Design a protein around this ligand. Structure first.
Ligand SMILES: O=C([O-])C(=O)[O-]
Ligand SMILES: O=C([O-])C(=O)[O-]
Ligand SMILES: O=C([O-])C(=O)[O-]
Ligand SMILES: O=C([O-])C(=O)[O-]
Ligand SMILES: O=C([O-])C(=O)[O-]
Ligand SMILES: [Co+2]
Ligand SMILES: [Co+2]
Ligand SMILES: [Co+2]
Ligand SMILES: [Co+2]
Ligand SMILES: [Co+2]
Ligand code: NA
Ligand code: NA
Ligand code: NA
Ligand code: NA
Ligand code: NA
Lengths: 376, 376, 376, 376, 376
């Protein structure tokens, strides 16, 4: 019913007004593992705790370094479009990564050689837009809801939109630029649109714009869920980085599915920081920060998590439904070190010497890697 | 039942897994006022979203700049003690301010001239401990739960405790220091205690330690709720700063009570930033950040809020119970500018010229200040 | 006619397209003193080199740290109002200092106790508005042009205006705040005004708003040119700081007049940095930056200058008209050390030992201070 | 005659002493486009506003981050040499890029394998010296004036010269280093030379030093104006980056010629910041900074301009002579996105939906890129 | 003989070439107390490890933040003058504090009102020169060696000297400034002197310069060793801060003498950081840094030590001669909390509860403060 912060003979009942409903969401924080210790930065924020920007055509909300200070290199947007609705043609400094959670959308991109790419993106699909290349998103008939990642954390939306530019350009100059009159463009919008209602497009193949510069070298979309996952006992892992999704130079990703009674094994990342989005399910994760520092967090749908470079962690399902979350990295490749596989590949007695345990332990070690394992 | 982010013809239903329960807590964020605009830093964090440290004798949890990056100058602890239980003798770099929310406690402090102050602190009472002066807290028979503020935001607990010092001092040196043998102190704790169980003390007057250095010049405790408040229509405001609570040089405070259907009026602070703790009730606040920037937040019990220097704001009760919250300032005095009183003290026609309104508006302006006002 | 960068046998003629007209403005930079040496930061910027913001009622342009990086603590605005025209009621984080160069204006200010101050300010008059206290400016019949200083350099205008606040506040809340209906304020401006046209006010004494809180302790205006200046041979110096202009806690100022063939003597400032505005005339100044570093600059009307803390400098008139400029300091008092008076107050032979000169030099030293001296 | 800051019913005449001559240089700043909005950092500085360092043999002046704070990654020197005159053998941390505007010069460079490169550089030619590789410049018979760029903005000249090193090395050590006596080097300069007069060299082929290490892999000079430019209607663009000028790893450049009545089209850069030098002509440029922020600047000969990463801009000729300026980038390649070509490669109706315009607009869009366009 | 890093069953002999002589100087670092733990910044640097600047007349060497990064607010110079020798008239941004260790010197200072102070300073005497006020030092017949402290740590000597200024000022300007000819000052030094040989002065009373501005309000010299010290069992403490040495606003100091077999008691400072100079003797000090962090250092003559704000420490004599060292604070007052006196002024049983000890311990506690205690 009413949880209290009490572990054996430690803790006490809360005696002041309180937020019982969040307490129920964070059992491993109201009552942390004995093994937790030391000061650790917050690694947890909820999109439901952010200002939702509402437009005609949908909404957008963001978690940034101003919300989650630990994540300096990475920021995120939860964006929703209604059918036909357009996220306005635009560009950023930051590169853009996306996972399509609900629905479908058509995207356009034009690169620096004037070659265009137009494609339809479904559930489980990704796009990656390189830094500074202009693009757009239009929801199809189901509408669309997707998660966006940008490789800077100071990122507010702070974005360049097509009509915001022209609205703050002398009409004199725009005319000269295109070779028309001032009057011929009297009706340019006096203000940005950002997201706006529009009619559903037609077939993709009818929208494909052909040009003298040719096809682009590598596609900007990736069908993640149509690749053969790494399947282990308690779940699936789908990886997309610059090695298979070529243009994704600055973002490496993994979609992790964890069945009930399963966990993303103890591991860490040797290349860089890990940014997390929880799509569905409930989880806990303890972050090992070295020098006997450790802090445990709770996550569920709509939460952003974080694991600083090289810190040891696990991700454990603690509910009845499957756990589905994204592992995101600002890097050109995915990499992890498995605790199991590490010790498996060392001399038996050496490990035994370290852990004060016998052969009955080293016998269970596996030399294959199993990202997601299941209980007994 | 199920809230959606929809305002008239803007927004759309959520189509991905989500945190309905937080959504219900943040109505003015899932559906913000039309008048909200622009990128504004998060001004909202919940203690229920922090790691609770559990000890024999109670708990402590903290909101810091690592949780709420905007608050660089101020940090807070929610501390709970069981009866008899001692928060260990210690000292910090930071000055310490407190509000006793539940129960009662006995405190000790000794200053830099070797004068001691020992006092009992009840519900509604404050203490202020200057930077670097050593102190302690012991809960009496009801136990104790209080809110602590420290005038640095980078503050982890990162504190100097008496037994942690001696445990990391050569026994050789401790002995020489006091003029005893190594054996006479063989039983010094090999580890810090921090919070620990203990027997209830006796009467205060039996604990008063007398010394050759004399009484301290100004008390370190303040009975806030025994002062005559500023009473206006919709509520009460109790102010304590360096002008009435003399030793409170670096912390100015206000306890604000707002009845249902009432609000803390539109105002701002000309001296410095405002840090907020919500003791009970539910609230919304819009922060006006200049240059047409504004963001609205929701608050309830256990939440920390923030208002950057000089930004315009109001605090409105949006539930059935009274709204009770603290306004905290890193400064030697409390100061606000009331929107009402400002315009009241200007020429009638001048204000009219500004607002495009008539005498039917200027007639309502009041030259007295009413921090908390009530509706119609 | 055509200046070249040539000093004796150093330099050469310019051989690329060039800006002859600026070259003519900076003779001591195109051809620096032999004695100049080393890398020194730019200490010179012109308001004519800034974006002029044009409104109905006037203009405003600013020199900030984004223009002049050396000046981190101080920024400036050149503001112009037409007759009747209002700079909109507003407030800043930064304190505000002003010199009325042309015309006259009426100002209002209300402090944190709800006491109002309304006064008329003429040519040669100052105002100082403490941090966060709300104010306004309205030009009288001649109109008005004045120089503003704010004690932060990162200061863009980034200011809080009255109608910008209300436009980004829920109408629901504004109504409750004042106790009127939504309809009663349907006509509130949907946008800031900033500067706007208005009818000339009436007599000052008819505008004086009386209140229950009383008169303010110290006036916010100062008649600088009606004080007896420090008169020396080549000019006049008028000083206003916290010692005579009481409320001017964070800004110390001097208006310096230098006749032709005269100079502001060799001196430095022991308290803090010096910020300069050149009102009229032409000047040169060499900044001595220690360790044999020295750079000379040219200044004329509309230029901002700067002298980092304690650096040695002189200000010399190099044209036919009087030189009039402001010395501004972020401090509660004015202070200078005169090179002459320094050496005058030391033993004769001691100075002689230092400078390798005789009694024919020490005999000219004066023990009185003469800020501004004249040639032979 | 006398310009005023007046646009229709906005602005007013200047009423204080002022710099009419600079006002005449900045028409689009004294009177900005209506479409300008918001606070934008200064993007404009003039070499004529810098201290000219005069030596026997020529001069050097620099624009740095201390002059133009926005340009943190890039700094520049305007250097002039007389005939025969030597810029002393030296090296920097920063890489060095150059454009030869007037005259000609002979350069030497020796790399880290002891291979030397000696070459003659004429008008329109470039050199690039990698970081830390030692080099020199000697003007031939016409003398020489060139623009230097270094890929750090904090760059003062702060350079290592050959004789400054030896002058601050123990003579004992120098002797041991070369295997001579102290007396054999008694005449080493006791001070740096930097720039000094010297006799004209002979034929290049007579100076070519041959060594056991061999020819260098890629030349350090590039004949820019002997390459076939991108020719469009209103001008020419010559590009040199790491793809054609191999060693130019950290500097990408474009020489842009704009005829009268022409403009460098609306575009932006997706890779990095743009640094500008105006060689001849007069120009205006509006910088689109996103979020409805835009500021217009004026440029002419001797001015440095700047465009932060990805910001939208155009460069328009506003005088009777051709406009010639350099686009400089700290990157290994040149890249731009053309506004025209972007929209050209999108579906017709999609663009129409965005801009609120018809087919009479989309019909003018071109799929080829025309950097420089001409009016009607 | 040969020390090894071995404590009981921990450590091992050194097996690589090593610095046995420093090892002998740092016994408590080669073999630290068991109680040491954790990463702590270096708190120790030796003047013998710095570049000695040699001039005609003496030397100067400095320890700065570039040597000892922990000390950001404070820097020091060891300065030596020969008889008659002059440290050149000069001024700094930083305030200047001094202790005269050997010999004697005459100082001059002139303040901002043109009042001069000239005085003779002996062994055990201090001077304090406020920020930016010009001064000089001349050694008398024994010569002089003194320790200087400046309240900034980034302080190189980076100082303004009188002849460096005039050497980098146009002769034209100097002449106009004083009203003489260029020829009358043809012999001004073309270079700074800094320290230079000179004849011994005469009697002080013959050097006293009288002026129209009057005597200075408070002297700039303090006879420290002629005040009655705090005398305790193992030593003496002489304190000088703004309360007794009035002008010493930004520097608080203590000269501490510790007899053999004695120690500066366990204590900390509640106001600010402690900077240390060891004049004579040998010492060890353990710094308690909180969170179980502690590091022990060794000090002897010529060493600079440091104790960050509020950190617990003791200073123990570990040799045969008395220990003499300075405690320096950037603050307007001296303050310490004694561990003994703290616990002495608390209830007996309360302390007992904390330390797990009995009355046989609390009985030894003293309510008087004894900075320096002696062993048994
Ligand atoms: O989709 C985007 O690029 C955005 O929201 O800024
Ligand atoms: O109470 C305190 O001082 C703490 O928690 O650090
Ligand atoms: O006058 C002012 O305060 C301004 O321009 O921001
Ligand atoms: O040419 C250069 O390298 C310079 O001026 O430092
Ligand atoms: O004595 C001084 O002031 C110095 O050494 O800079
Ligand atoms: Co991971
Ligand atoms: Co407030
Ligand atoms: Co000055
Ligand atoms: Co460009
Ligand atoms: Co101490
Ligand atoms: Na550990
Ligand atoms: Na606005
Ligand atoms: Na020098
Ligand atoms: Na906008
Ligand atoms: Na510990």
């Amino acid at each position: 019913d009413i949880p209290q912060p009490i572990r054996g003979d430690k803790g006490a009942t809360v005696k002041i007004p309180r937020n019982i409903e969040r307490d129920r969401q964070n059992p491993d924080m109201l009552v942390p593992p004995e093994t937790d210790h030391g000061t650790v930065s917050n690694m947890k924020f909820s999109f439901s705790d952010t200002h939702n920007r509402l437009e005609k055509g949908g909404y957008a909300r963001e978690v940034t370094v101003r919300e989650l200070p630990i994540s300096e290199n990475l920021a995120s947007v939860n964006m929703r479009l209604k059918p036909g609705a357009i996220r306005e043609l635009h560009w950023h400094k930051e590169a853009e990564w996306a996972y399509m959670i609900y629905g479908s959308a058509r995207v356009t991109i034009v690169d620096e050689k004037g070659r265009s790419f137009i494609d339809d993106v479904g559930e489980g699909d990704l796009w990656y837009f390189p830094s500074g290349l202009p693009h757009s998103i239009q929801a199809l008939e189901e509408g669309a809801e997707f998660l966006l990642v940008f490789d800077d954390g100071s990122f507010s939306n702070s974005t360049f939109q097509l009509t915001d530019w022209l609205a703050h350009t002398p009409k004199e100059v725009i005319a000269a630029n295109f070779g028309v009159t001032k009057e011929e463009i009297s009706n340019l919008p006096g203000k940005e649109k950002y997201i706006f209602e529009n009619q559903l497009p037609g077939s993709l193949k009818d929208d494909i714009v052909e040009g003298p510069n040719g096809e682009v070298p590598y596609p900007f979309t990736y069908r993640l869920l149509e690749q053969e996952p790494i399947e282990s006992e308690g779940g699936k892992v789908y990886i997309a980085d610059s090695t298979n999704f070529k243009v994704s130079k600055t973002i490496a990703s993994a979609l992790v599915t964890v069945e009930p009674g399963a966990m993303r094994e103890l591991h860490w990342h040797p290349n860089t920081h890990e940014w997390q989005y929880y799509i569905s399910g409930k989880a806990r994760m303890t972050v090992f920060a070295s020098d006997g520092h450790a802090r445990t967090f709770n996550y569920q749908a709509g939460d952003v998590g974080y694991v600083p470079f090289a810190m040891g962690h696990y991700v454990e399902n603690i509910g009845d439904e499957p756990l589905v979350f994204l592992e995101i990295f600002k890097d050109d490749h995915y990499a992890d070190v498995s605790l199991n596989q590490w010790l498996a590949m060392l001399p038996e007695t050496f490990v035994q010497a370290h852990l004060d345990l016998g052969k009955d332990f080293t016998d269970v070690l596996s030399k294959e890697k199993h990202p997601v394992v299941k209980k007994k």
